[model samples]
Target: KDSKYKMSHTFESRQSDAAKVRERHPDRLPIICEKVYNSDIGELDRCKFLVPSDLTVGQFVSVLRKRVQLEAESALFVYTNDTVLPSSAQMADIYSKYKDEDGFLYMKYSGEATFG
Candidate 1:
């Protein structure tokens, strides 16, 4: 036992998750977020996410909040028309309503120092 040393554990192959996701949730949708108007973010444009087909606007915000590094006290809002996208609204509904020909649901950030 004098030669005993630290043991080690190994994880599975570190590869892209794209293949795994396909196998697990074939129905998931690819979400593309493009930040326009240079909101003082690092280029603030063109990020992609794969999410459940039934995600809500509120849930999406939770994900987006991380991307934007939003302030805890400030509100993070996203919209297309004058109306705001509420938390209960489904992503599929919103995407069909606002998705562009390129398949991006073009959204402008709201609140001061947020949008186009």
Candidate 2:
């Protein structure tokens, strides 16, 4: 569970990786989603995603909820470059506002404590 390899290579190849994805799917946004280090929810099956520009933030969270098998009462928080993103925000706007220089939108998610 102490794998640092993915991120080491991820940061190194991000530029080229984003470039190729954008070239192939100009309308899709390249997204890299990861859970907070202390998050209790399980990891996603895959971290990289090509998301449609028109999708809303809420919908994306819904997808993540199912992916992580979150309980019905659990609350999920999604951060775009460390700032909270509104559920109503559209993917296109989020990508333009928060995408990294390498052309990838990094989403970090965490589960809030629901009970004592």
Candidate 3:
């Protein structure tokens, strides 16, 4: 049976196929990605995180911008309990479907002084 607290894992994964393609065409940007795995039970699981050779932080920011903008309705401007400010990039992979159940739409980084 699944555990009471929902469990999830988030990690980085390399895009090898894309890397190979970029190898043939050096001008092409390599694609690195983060994968999220979730379970209803809270058991430990093995997962892998990979970094491709050709992807850059800029690329990630671009992808993030597009996704957040497109899904603005589902996006939150405030951070979750698990969200860490110094480790924002790492927490980016952590997604929860019910995060906005309280009807709040904004999420702020951990160091914010006041709610706006």
The estimated TM-scores of all candidates read 0.59, 0.82, 0.25
- The true-versus-predicted C-alpha distance at residue 26 of model 1, in Å, is 3.9
Worst 10 residues of 2 by lDDT: 1-10
Q: Supply candidate 2's per-residue lDDT for 95.
A: 90
lDDT of 2 at 40: 73
List ranges where model 3 is wrong by over 4 Å. Answer: 1-19, 35-59, 68-116
For model 1, what is the error of residue 62's alpha carbon versus the real structure, in angstroms, after optimal superposition? Answer: 0.8
Clashes of 3: 5
Model 1: how far residue 98 lies from native, Å: 1.9
Write the residue-wise lDDT of candidate 2 on 58-101 in tens digits: 88888778777888798898887667788999978999988887
TM-score, predicted candidate 2 vs. hidden true structure:
0.82
**Per-model C-alpha lDDT, please?**
0.56, 0.79, 0.29
Pairs that collide in candidate 1 are none
CA shift of 77, model 2, Å: 1.4
Question: Residue 54 of model 3: what lDDT?
Answer: 43
Q: What is the lDDT of residue 27 in candidate 3?
A: 44
Global fold similarity of model 1 (TM-score)? 0.59
Candidate 2: stretches off by over 4 Å: 1-6, 10-12, 114-116
Pairwise lDDT winner, candidates 1 and 3: 1
